[PDB]
């Protein structure tokens, strides 16, 4: 619907749809994106006009009268009047042609008015519409287009028809309406409306969702740019400052006033076009000084500065002896011109060594610029020149009278020893032997010294910088340095860093949301401790009394994510410097050895990675069929020894069935995880649609354009999924030579479990227990993707996908750098000056966008190093975790690895490392070794394999385990070393109860 | 103490405590740090 | 000189008198670590003039 009731303070419900809204321009229109801007869309009053109704109002925008307004009415000014109907012909005025009666300043009557039949200029009466003035065309609009939908009216006078400002009047104090309509649906609006700052989003022009930057939160989404803020921290403001007090203080000085007074008499003419032009001839007057008017010298400590303005009237021929009339009044005013200040600003405690005003331009540091302003223009008529020389002995102040007043313990102005600012000004005990005033490094005032007693005195900022912590899109709590409330947080508690204000009750156990370091904050706005990680420890290599084993297992899923690979560009040097333009091209001929530059590196840093990434992948056919849900899912390859096993999958497959490719994907050998993570994360590598011209380019055919190539990568990722498939199917591939022969993944799955312990209870085994473990995980981890380390993971890509976004961004927009040129469009310069003029202009033009190229060359160089460590990182895991079982101990993740998988991610590659997470410990009593005695032989015999503990039974029978897993074996005589002596540390034996 | 004897050329010896003696300035006075400045400190 | 300053107040003045008080004013620093200095070789002074003209 059209008609909304506007909340308190008159913003627009989020329910709305804008369908007769647009945003307001002076230039191009925004085709999508989101914005921060000043747009006026503060709706004070909403008038509905229903169809077959009568909308007629004469309003002035100082004065909020209103008829009708479906809501509450507000109280402010009304800067802009819209219409929003759709204007078409069918739409009737009750004043004739005129549609729009302008009352303007002075009181001049414009017209807006339609005919059917074209009236030509400075006479009187599709259709074709006028501003007339006085019954006469004064100016042409055009034809009325079919497609208009709204009509904006300004108080300055700028009308805008569908968000574009087409027209500018005279600013306007009244407007007369008398409008009615038949086919605007069912209501069609007036609002009237104010400026306000808000975030709006636009889809095809078109407006979609306006946040109101009104509240503290809704002032983090604005800056944010975003209307959905993720949970974090973000800086903010502690307070805001207004409405303060001056305190102003400089060095002991006599006190002798002056006051010089510019007389400024302004002859004023009416042209022929009966507008105001104000004479060269007007005179500037002086204070007598010395016999002379035209030079003045500031000769006392403290002086003020004022203008007195008289006007006269003549009539062409310069001789004004009338006084001015409505039309020709004018005041004088006094511009900054070519100074460093402003001459209003003199009384404002600015101090000099020497100050002189002339009238006569020899000597002169600056100039003032004397002009006439009337009711519509300000035109400059004469020069008002500065001699003036930095010091202190001099001061402009305000009015004739101590100027020495200070403020302290509360917020204020100050302006000491020259030195200007806002802040707390308190009173230290500390003693400072040398120099008046101190800065920072940053050149900001921190003290200064009382030259009556030597007190010093410290400046502090009024507001500091804070965080304010962001869970489910309200703020629960802020950190500050200063207690003081904020953010509209009452609660507050301190901290040995900081004090910390909360929604929690503070005159805690809770899960903390979002943590850094060992600060925590939960959702109720509570800080908590975080502490360090607790572990039971690790498994020693001791072989000497009571040991523990662990013994029951469960299986672990742990994910990481690793870069393998950029996003490589091509850019055209001469295409990015000069837009095509053939005597750009001529200028750049003489730093062609730069373009060849940045083109080499770029080429060769591109050629190194795919010369990189190709050795690294590969595929195996006979992998590759196996390489699928349905495959897994059915016994057609497995080997007819296993005819037990229903298929290959078997009790795993709950949980592979998320990691192989299926069938049910939006491409070929896609997985759900993979999809998952490119569709929650993460366009057209085409080129062919960029030059065909059937709709309005965009962001990437725009960067073609510009000579920006973004090479291909979908190649790249399609490898990277079968490398991965290939990967996963390789583990159930009984021979290589042949067919694709398969065996169940509980077999691979026992020979991992060998690999990292003998196992030797060949009957009871579960293998159950680690199928459902693994199974819940990976339904765990999916669920996630649509668990820390999935959490980091997704992090990790994102923030690689964004840096590779904003590298390409930021060169791009580089391109709107004028370089202080008159334009940034060389097009522009050739069209505007001679080719030697031009030729400069385009030349800072070129220097600035090759320097722009370097620093993205740079950039990208740099990106790509740290890829390549990271890509040998990949190699590694690959090589190691996936591929075999590494004796490296915790590569493969934390715990005792099993086994690994991986699927492509973007822009690389995300393993899933499968570990055994111990829940028990065997205690058992180790022994270092035996002492055999055979009556008078006595040996030692020690383990031969140093990683087994031997130990004893409850039949004093000798058995050997792993520490690893708890897999207790009994010890024959081919397990054991002879040696002559024994340790004190040994188990006494004799021969009989021997081993073997 | 507050009395040395300049050594040749006119340095100030190292172990002089300079309890009389500042930096001059035309702005604000540094609190702490070392710095290469031009000075009055050749005692004729 | 290199001034050393705490608290407003002179604490050590080293004079760029010599070639190793040259170093340690360019080190900004009166106590140097052993190692090698990048140095200039002598210095110019009072030296004619040569006008060579088509
Ligand atoms: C690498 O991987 C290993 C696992 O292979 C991780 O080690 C585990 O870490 C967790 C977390 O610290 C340990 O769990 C904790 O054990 C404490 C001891 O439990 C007692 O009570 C149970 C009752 O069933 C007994 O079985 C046990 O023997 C103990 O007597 C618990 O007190 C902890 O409880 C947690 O939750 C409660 C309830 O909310 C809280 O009150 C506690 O404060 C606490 O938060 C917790 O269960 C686990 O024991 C470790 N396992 C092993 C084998 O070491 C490593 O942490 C990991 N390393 C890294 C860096 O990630
Ligand atoms: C397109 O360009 C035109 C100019 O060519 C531009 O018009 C400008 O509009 C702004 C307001 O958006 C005008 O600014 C004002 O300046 C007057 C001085 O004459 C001030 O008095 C005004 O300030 C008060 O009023 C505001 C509204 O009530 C308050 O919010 C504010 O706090 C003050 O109380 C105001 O700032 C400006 O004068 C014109 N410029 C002209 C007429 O030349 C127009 O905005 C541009 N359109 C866009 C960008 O969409
Ligand atoms: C604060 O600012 C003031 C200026 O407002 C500044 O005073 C300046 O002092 C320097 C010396 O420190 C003066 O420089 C001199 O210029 C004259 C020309 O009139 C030269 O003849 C001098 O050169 C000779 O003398 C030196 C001393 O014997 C020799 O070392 C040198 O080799 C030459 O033989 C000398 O360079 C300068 O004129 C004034 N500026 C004025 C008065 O405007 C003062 O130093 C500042 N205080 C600080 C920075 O602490
Ligand atoms: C690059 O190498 C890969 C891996 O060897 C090739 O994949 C193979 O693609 C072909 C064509 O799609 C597949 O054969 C066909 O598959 C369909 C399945 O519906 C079936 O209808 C046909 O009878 C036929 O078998 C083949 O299975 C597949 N190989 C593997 C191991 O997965 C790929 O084609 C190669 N690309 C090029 C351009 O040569
Ligand atoms: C994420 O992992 C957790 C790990 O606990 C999974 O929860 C577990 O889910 C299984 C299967 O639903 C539950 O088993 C069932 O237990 C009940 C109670 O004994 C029993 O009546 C049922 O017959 C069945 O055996 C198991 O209890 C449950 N564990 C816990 C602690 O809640 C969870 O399912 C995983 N999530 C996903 C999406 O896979
Ligand atoms: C707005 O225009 C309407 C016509 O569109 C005006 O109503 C007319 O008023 C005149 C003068 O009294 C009557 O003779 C006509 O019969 C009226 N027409 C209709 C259709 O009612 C109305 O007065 C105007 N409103 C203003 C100027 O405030
Ligand atoms: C256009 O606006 C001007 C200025 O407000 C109006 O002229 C005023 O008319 C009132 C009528 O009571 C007088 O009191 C004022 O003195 C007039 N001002 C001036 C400067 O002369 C004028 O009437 C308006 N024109 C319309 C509404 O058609
Ligand atoms: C202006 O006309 C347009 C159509 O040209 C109106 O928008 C349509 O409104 C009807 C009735 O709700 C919808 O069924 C259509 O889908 C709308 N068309 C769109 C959105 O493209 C619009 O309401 C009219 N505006 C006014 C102020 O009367
Ligand atoms: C500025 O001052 C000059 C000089 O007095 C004025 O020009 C004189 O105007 C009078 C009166 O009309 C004439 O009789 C003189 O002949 C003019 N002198 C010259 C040299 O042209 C001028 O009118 C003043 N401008 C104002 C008051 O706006
Ligand atoms: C600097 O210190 C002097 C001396 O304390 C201050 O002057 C005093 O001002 C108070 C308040 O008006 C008087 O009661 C004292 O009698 C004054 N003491 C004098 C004149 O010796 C002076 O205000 C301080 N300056 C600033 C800027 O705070
Ligand atoms: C290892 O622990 C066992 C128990 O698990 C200890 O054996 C017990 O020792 C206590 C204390 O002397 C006796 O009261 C019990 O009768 C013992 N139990 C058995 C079954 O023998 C043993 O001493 C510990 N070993 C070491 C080396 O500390
Ligand atoms: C593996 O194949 C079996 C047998 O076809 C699938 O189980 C069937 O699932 C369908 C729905 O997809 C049910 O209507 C049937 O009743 C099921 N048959 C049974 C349980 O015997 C099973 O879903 C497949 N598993 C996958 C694809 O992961
Ligand atoms: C490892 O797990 C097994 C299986 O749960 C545990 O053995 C059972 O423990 C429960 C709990 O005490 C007893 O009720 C059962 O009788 C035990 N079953 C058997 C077959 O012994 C075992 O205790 C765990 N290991 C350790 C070292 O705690
Ligand atoms: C194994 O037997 C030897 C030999 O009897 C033991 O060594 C004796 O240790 C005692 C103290 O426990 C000493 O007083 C004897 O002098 C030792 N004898 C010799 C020949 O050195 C040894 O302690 C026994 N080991 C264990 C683990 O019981
Ligand atoms: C007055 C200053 C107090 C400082 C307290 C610091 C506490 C929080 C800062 C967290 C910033 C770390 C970056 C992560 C931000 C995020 O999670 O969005
Ligand atoms: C020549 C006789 C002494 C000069 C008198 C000058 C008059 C006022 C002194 C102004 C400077 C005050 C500096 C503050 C010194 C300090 O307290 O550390
Ligand atoms: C005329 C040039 C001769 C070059 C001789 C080079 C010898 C020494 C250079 C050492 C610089 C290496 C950096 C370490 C510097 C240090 O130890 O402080
Ligand atoms: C415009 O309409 C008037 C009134 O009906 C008519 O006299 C005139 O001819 C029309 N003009 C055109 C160009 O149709
Ligand atoms: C406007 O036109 C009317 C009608 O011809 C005329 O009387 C009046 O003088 C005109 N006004 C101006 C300011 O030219
Ligand atoms: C300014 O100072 C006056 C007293 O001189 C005090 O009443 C007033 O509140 C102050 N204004 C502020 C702090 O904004
Ligand atoms: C200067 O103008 C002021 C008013 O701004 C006035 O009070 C004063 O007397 C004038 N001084 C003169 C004319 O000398
Ligand atoms: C906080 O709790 C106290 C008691 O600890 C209670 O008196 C007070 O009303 C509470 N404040 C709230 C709920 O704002
Ligand atoms: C300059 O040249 C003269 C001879 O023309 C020579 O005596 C003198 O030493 C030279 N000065 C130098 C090298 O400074």
Same mark, same amino acid.
């Given at each position: 619907?059209?008609?909304?009731?506007?909340?308190?303070?008159?913003?627009?419900?989020?329910?709305?749809?804008?369908?007769?809204?647009?945003?307001?321009?002076?230039?191009?229109?925004?085709?999508?994106?989101?914005?921060?801007?000043?747009?006026?869309?503060?709706?004070?009053?909403?008038?509905?006009?229903?169809?077959?109704?009568?909308?007629?109002?004469?309003?002035?925008?100082?004065?909020?009268?209103?008829?009708?307004?479906?809501?509450?009415?507000?109280?402010?000014?009304?800067?802009?009047?819209?219409?929003?109907?759709?204007?078409?012909?069918?739409?009737?005025?009750?004043?004739?042609?005129?549609?729009?009666? *302008?009352?303007?300043?002075?009181?001049?009557?414009?017209?807006?008015?339609?005919?059917?039949?074209?009236?030509?200029?400075?006479?009187?009466?599709?259709?074709?519409?006028?501003?007339?003035?006085?019954?006469?065309?004064?100016?042409?609009?055009?034809?009325?287009?079919?497609?208009?939908?709204?009509?904006?009216?300004?108080?300055?006078?700028?009308?805008?028809? !569908?968000?574009? !400002?087409?027209?500018?009047?005279?600013?306007?104090?009244?407007?007369?309406?008398?409008?009615?309509?038949?086919?605007?649906?069912?209501?069609?609006?007036?609002?009237?409306?104010?400026?306000?700052?808000?975030?709006?989003?636009?889809?095809?022009?078109?407006?979609?969702?306006?946040?109101?930057?009104? &509240?503290?939160?809704?002032?983090?989404?604005?800056?944010?740019?975003?209307?959905?803020?993720? !949970?974090?921290?973000?800086?903010?403001?502690?307070?805001?400052?207004?409405?303060?007090?001056?305190?102003?203080?400089?060095?002991?000085?006599?006190?002798?006033?002056?006051?010089?007074?510019?007389?400024?008499?302004? /002859?004023?003419?009416?042209?022929?076009?009966?507008?105001?032009?104000?004479?060269?001839?007007?005179?500037?007057?002086?204070?007598?000084?010395?016999?002379?008017?035209?030079?003045?010298?500031?000769?006392?400590?403290?002086?003020?500065?004022?203008?007195?303005?008289?006007?006269?009237?003549?009539?062409?021929?310069?001789?004004?002896?009338?006084?001015?009339?409505?039309?020709?009044?004018?005041?004088?005013?006094?511009?900054?011109?070519?100074?460093?200040? =402003?001459?209003?600003?003199?009384?404002? +405690?600015?101090?000099?060594?020497?100050?002189?005003?002339?009238?006569?331009?020899?000597?002169?540091?600056?100039?003032?610029?004397?002009?006439?302003?009337?009711?519509?223009?300000?035109?400059?008529?004469?020069?008002? +020149?500065?001699?003036?020389?930095?010091?202190?002995?001099?001061?402009?102040?305000?009015?004739?009278?101590?100027?020495?007043?200070?403020? *302290?313990?509360?917020?204020?102005?100050?302006?000491?020893?020259?030195?200007? /600012?806002?802040?707390?000004?308190?009173?230290?005990?500390?003693?400072?032997?040398?120099?008046?005033?101190?800065?920072?490094?940053?050149?900001?005032?921190?003290?200064?010294?009382?030259?009556?007693?030597?007190?010093?005195?410290?400046?502090?900022?009024?507001?500091?910088?804070?965080?304010?912590?962001?869970?489910?899109?309200?703020?629960?709590?802020?950190?500050?340095?200063?207690?003081?409330?904020?953010?509209?947080?009452?609660?507050?508690?301190?901290?040995?860093?900081?004090?910390?204000?909360?929604? +929690?009750?503070?005159?805690?156990?809770?899960?903390?949301?979002?943590?850094?370091?060992?600060?925590?904050?939960?959702?109720?706005?509570?800080?908590?401790?975080?502490?360090?990680?607790?572990?039971?420890?690790?498994?020693?290599?001791?072989?000497? /009394?009571?040991?523990?084993?662990?013994?029951?297992?469960?299986?672990?899923?742990?994910?990481?994510?690793?870069?393998?690979?950029?996003?490589?560009?091509?850019?055209?040097?001469?295409?990015?410097?000069?837009?095509? !333009?053939?005597?750009?091209?001529?200028? *750049?001929?003489?730093?062609? =050895?730069?373009?060849?530059?940045?083109?080499?590196?770029?080429?060769?840093?591109?050629?190194?990675?795919?010369?990189?990434?190709?050795?690294?992948?590969?595929?195996?056919?006979?992998?590759?069929?196996?390489?699928?849900?349905?495959?897994?899912?059915?016994?057609?390859?497995?080997?007819?020894?296993?005819?037990?096993?229903?298929?290959?999958?078997?009790?795993?497959?709950?949980?592979?069935?998320?990691?192989?490719?299926?069938?049910?994907?939006?491409?070929?050998?896609?997985?759900?995880?993979?999809?998952?993570?490119?569709?929650?994360?993460?366009?057209?590598?085409?080129?062919?649609?960029?030059?065909?011209?059937?709709?309005?380019?965009?962001?990437?055919?725009?960067?073609?354009?510009?000579?920006?190539?973004?090479?291909?990568?979908?190649?790249?990722?399609?490898?990277?999924?079968? +490398?991965?498939?290939?990967?996963?199917?390789?583990?159930?591939?009984?021979?290589?030579?042949?067919?694709?022969?398969?065996?169940?993944?509980?077999?691979?799955?026992?020979?991992?479990?060998?690999?990292?312990?003998?196992?030797?209870?060949?009957?009871?085994?579960?293998?159950?227990?680690?199928?459902?473990?693994?199974?819940?995980?990976?339904?765990?981890?999916?669920?996630?993707?649509?668990?820390?380390?999935?959490?980091?993971?997704?992090?990790?890509?994102?923030?690689?996908?964004?840096?590779?976004?904003?590298?390409?961004?930021?060169?791009?927009?580089?391109?709107?750098?004028?370089?202080?040129?008159?334009?940034? &469009?060389?097009?522009?310069?050739?069209?505007?000056?001679?080719?030697?003029?031009?030729?400069?202009?385009?030349?800072?033009?070129?220097?600035?966008?090759?320097?722009? *190229?370097?620093?993205?060359?740079?950039?990208?160089?740099?990106?790509?190093?740290?890829?390549?460590?990271?890509?040998?990182?990949?190699?590694?895991?690959?090589?190691?975790?996936?591929?075999?079982?590494?004796?490296?101990?915790?590569?493969?993740?934390?715990?005792?690895?099993?086994?690994?998988?991986?699927?492509?991610?973007?822009?690389?590659?995300?393993?899933?490392?499968?570990?055994?997470?111990?829940?028990?410990?065997?205690?058992?009593?180790?022994?270092?070794?035996?002492?055999?005695?055979?009556?008078?032989?006595?040996?030692?015999?020690?383990?031969?394999?140093?990683?087994?503990?031997?130990?004893?039974?409850?039949?004093?029978?000798?058995?050997?385990?792993?520490?690893?897993?708890?897999?207790?074996?009994?010890?024959?005589?081919?397990?054991?070393?002879?040696?002559?002596?024994?340790?004190?540390?040994?188990?006494?034996?004799?021969?009989?109860?021997?081993?073997?």
């Amino acid at each position: 619907t059209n008609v909304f009731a506007p909340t308190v303070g008159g913003y627009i419900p989020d329910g709305f749809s804008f369908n007769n809204w647009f945003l307001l321009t002076n230039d191009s229109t925004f085709v999508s994106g989101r914005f921060v801007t000043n747009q006026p869309l503060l709706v004070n009053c909403l008038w509905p006009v229903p169809s077959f109704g009568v909308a007629a109002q004469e309003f002035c925008f100082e004065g909020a009268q209103f008829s009708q307004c479906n809501g509450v009415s507000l109280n402010n000014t009304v800067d802009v009047i819209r219409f929003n109907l759709n204007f078409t012909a069918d739409v009737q005025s009750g004043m004739g042609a005129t549609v729009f009666s *302008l009352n303007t300043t002075g009181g001049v009557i414009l017209e807006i008015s339609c005919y059917n039949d074209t009236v030509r200029e400075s006479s009187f009466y599709p259709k074709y519409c006028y501003v007339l003035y006085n019954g006469t065309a004064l100016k042409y609009l055009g034809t009325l287009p079919p497609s208009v939908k709204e009509i904006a009216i300004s108080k300055w006078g700028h009308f805008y028809i !569908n968000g574009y !400002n087409f027209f500018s009047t005279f600013p306007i104090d009244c407007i007369s309406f008398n409008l009615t309509t038949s086919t605007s649906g069912a209501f069609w609006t007036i609002a009237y409306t104010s400026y306000t700052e808000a975030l709006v989003q636009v889809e095809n022009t078109a407006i979609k969702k306006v946040t109101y930057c009104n &509240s503290h939160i809704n002032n983090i989404k604005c800056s944010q740019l975003t209307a959905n803020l993720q !949970n974090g921290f973000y800086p903010v403001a502690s307070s805001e400052v207004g409405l303060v007090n001056k305190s102003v203080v400089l060095l002991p000085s006599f006190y002798s006033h002056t006051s010089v007074n510019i007389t400024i008499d302004l /002859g004023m003419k009416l042209s022929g076009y009966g507008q105001p032009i104000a004479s060269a001839l007007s005179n500037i007057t002086l204070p007598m000084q010395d016999n002379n008017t035209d030079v003045y010298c500031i000769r006392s400590n403290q002086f003020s500065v004022y203008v007195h303005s008289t006007c006269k009237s003549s009539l062409w021929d310069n001789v004004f002896n009338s006084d001015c009339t409505d039309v020709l009044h004018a005041t004088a005013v006094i511009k900054t011109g070519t100074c460093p200040f =402003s001459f209003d600003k003199l009384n404002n +405690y600015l101090t000099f060594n020497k100050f002189c005003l002339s009238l006569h331009p020899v000597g002169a540091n600056c100039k003032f610029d004397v002009a006439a302003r009337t009711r519509t223009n300000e035109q400059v008529v004469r020069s008002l +020149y500065v001699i003036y020389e930095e010091g202190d002995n001099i001061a402009g102040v305000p009015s004739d009278n101590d100027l020495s007043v200070l403020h *302290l313990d509360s917020c204020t102005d100050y302006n000491i020893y020259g030195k200007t /600012g806002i802040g707390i000004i308190r009173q230290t005990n500390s003693t400072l032997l040398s120099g008046l005033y101190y800065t920072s490094l940053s050149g900001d005032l921190l003290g200064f010294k009382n030259v009556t007693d030597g007190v010093v005195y410290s400046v502090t900022p009024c507001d500091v910088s804070a965080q304010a912590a962001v869970i489910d899109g309200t703020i629960v709590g802020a950190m500050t340095s200063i207690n003081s409330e904020l953010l509209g947080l009452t609660h507050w508690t301190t901290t040995p860093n900081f004090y910390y204000y909360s929604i +929690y009750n503070y005159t805690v156990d809770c899960e903390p949301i979002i943590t850094y370091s060992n600060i925590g904050v939960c959702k109720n706005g509570a800080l908590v401790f975080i502490n360090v990680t607790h572990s039971d420890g690790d498994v020693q290599p001791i072989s000497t /009394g009571n040991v523990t084993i662990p013994t029951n297992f469960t299986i672990s899923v742990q994910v990481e994510y690793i870069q393998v690979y950029t996003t490589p560009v091509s850019i055209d040097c001469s295409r990015y410097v000069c837009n095509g !333009n053939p005597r750009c091209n001529k200028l *750049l001929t003489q730093y062609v =050895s730069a373009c060849q530059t940045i083109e080499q590196a770029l080429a060769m840093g591109a050629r190194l990675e795919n010369m990189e990434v190709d050795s690294m992948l590969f595929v195996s056919e006979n992998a590759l069929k196996l390489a699928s849900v349905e495959a897994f899912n059915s016994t057609e390859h497995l080997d007819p020894i296993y005819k037990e096993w229903p298929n290959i999958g078997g009790s795993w497959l709950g949980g592979l069935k998320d990691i192989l490719p299926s069938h049910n994907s939006k491409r070929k050998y896609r997985s759900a995880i993979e999809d998952l993570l490119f569709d929650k994360v993460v366009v057209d590598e085409d080129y062919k649609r960029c030059t065909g011209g059937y709709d309005i380019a965009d962001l990437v055919c725009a960067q073609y354009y510009n000579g920006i190539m973004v090479l291909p990568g979908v190649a790249n990722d399609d490898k990277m999924t079968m +490398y991965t498939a290939s990967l996963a199917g390789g583990i159930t591939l009984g021979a290589l030579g042949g067919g694709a022969v398969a065996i169940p993944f509980a077999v691979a799955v026992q020979a991992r479990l060998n690999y990292v312990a003998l196992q030797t209870d060949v009957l009871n085994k579960n293998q159950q227990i680690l199928a459902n473990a693994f199974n819940q995980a990976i339904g765990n981890i999916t669920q996630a993707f649509g668990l820390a380390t999935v959490a980091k993971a997704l992090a990790k890509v994102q923030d690689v996908v964004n840096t590779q976004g904003q590298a390409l961004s930021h060169l791009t927009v580089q391109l709107q750098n004028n370089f202080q040129a008159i334009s940034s &469009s060389i097009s522009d310069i050739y069209n505007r000056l001679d080719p030697p003029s031009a030729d400069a202009q385009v030349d800072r033009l070129i220097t600035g966008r090759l320097t722009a *190229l370097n620093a993205f060359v740079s950039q990208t160089l740099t990106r790509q190093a740290e890829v390549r460590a990271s890509r040998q990182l990949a190699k590694d895991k690959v090589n190691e975790c996936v591929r075999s079982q590494s004796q490296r101990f915790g590569f493969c993740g934390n715990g005792t690895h099993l086994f690994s998988l991986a699927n492509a991610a973007p822009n690389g590659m995300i393993f899933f490392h499968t570990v055994l997470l111990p829940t028990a410990y065997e205690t058992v009593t180790a022994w270092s070794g035996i002492c055999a005695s055979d009556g008078d032989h006595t040996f030692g015999l020690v383990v031969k394999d140093v990683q087994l503990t031997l130990f004893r039974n409850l039949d004093d029978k000798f058995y050997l385990t792993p520490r690893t897993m708890y897999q207790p074996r009994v010890a024959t005589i081919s397990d054991f070393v002879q040696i002559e002596g024994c340790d004190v540390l040994f188990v006494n034996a004799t021969v009989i109860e021997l081993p073997g």
